[PDB]
Amino acid sequence: RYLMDPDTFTSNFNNDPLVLRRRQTYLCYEVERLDNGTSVKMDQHMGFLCNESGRHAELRFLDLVPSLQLDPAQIYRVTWFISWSPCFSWGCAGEVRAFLQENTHVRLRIKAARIYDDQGRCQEALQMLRDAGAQVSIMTYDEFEYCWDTFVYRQGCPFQPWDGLEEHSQALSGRLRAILQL
Numbered sequence: 041r042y043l044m045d046p047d048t049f050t051s052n053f054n055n056d057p058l059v060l061r062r063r064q065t066y067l068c069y070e071v072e073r074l075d076n077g078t079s080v081k082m083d084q085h086m087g088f089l090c091n092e093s094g095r096h097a098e099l100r101f102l103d104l105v106p107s108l109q110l111d112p113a114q115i116y117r118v119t120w121f122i123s124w125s126p127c128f129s130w131g132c133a134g135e136v137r138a139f140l141q142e143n144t145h146v147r148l149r150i151k152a153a154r155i156y157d158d159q160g161r162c163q164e165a166l167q168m169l170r171d172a173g174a175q176v177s178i179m180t181y182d183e184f185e186y187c188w189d190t191f192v193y194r195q196g197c198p199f200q201p202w203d204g205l206e207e208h209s210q211a212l213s214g215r216l217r218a219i220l221q222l
């Protein structure tokens with residue numbers, strides 16, 4: 041798989057709530073087959089995507105699913121590590137819902153660096169993802185470091201957290217959990 045530039049990772053996955061860049065979403069993905077009590081991952085089922093000319097990363101992932109050649113008789117967990125509020129863009133949650141309804145052999149996990157609580161459409165997109173069966177949670181230090189170790193061209197250098205990473209993660213998590221509470 042192609043590995044992400046490290047400054048691109050740090051700039052986009054920064055979870056500082058006071059920084060609200062309005063351009064890009066990065067989505068690191070992995071597909072795991074769940075079988076016999078373990079998880080089986082293929083390097084060819086791993087990589088990252090960004091928004092490209094108005095087509096958002098989430099939809100670009102849906103676009104590549106046929107190329108993954110998933111066995112409909114098996115169970116897969118798809119994990120997204122996404123740098124922006126999932127399905128922020130218009131109509132995105134509805135397209136993910138349709139995909140999940142048409143592919144019941146796929147379970148979607150979404151780990152988000154942040155969310156965008158607008159007490160409106162972007163907040164409702166989060167509930168739509170949950171209602172469609174996705175498991176949505178906030179990235180913690182564990183996920184940021186895993187993404188650094190796994191998807192980034194790091195040259196063996198260790199993950200260096202930014203100031204406030206944990207404080208920001210816990211605050212965002214509290215809000216996401218309130219939004220998705222049942």
Ligand SMILES: [Cl-]
Nearest residue numbers: 177178213216
């Ligand atoms: Cl969470």
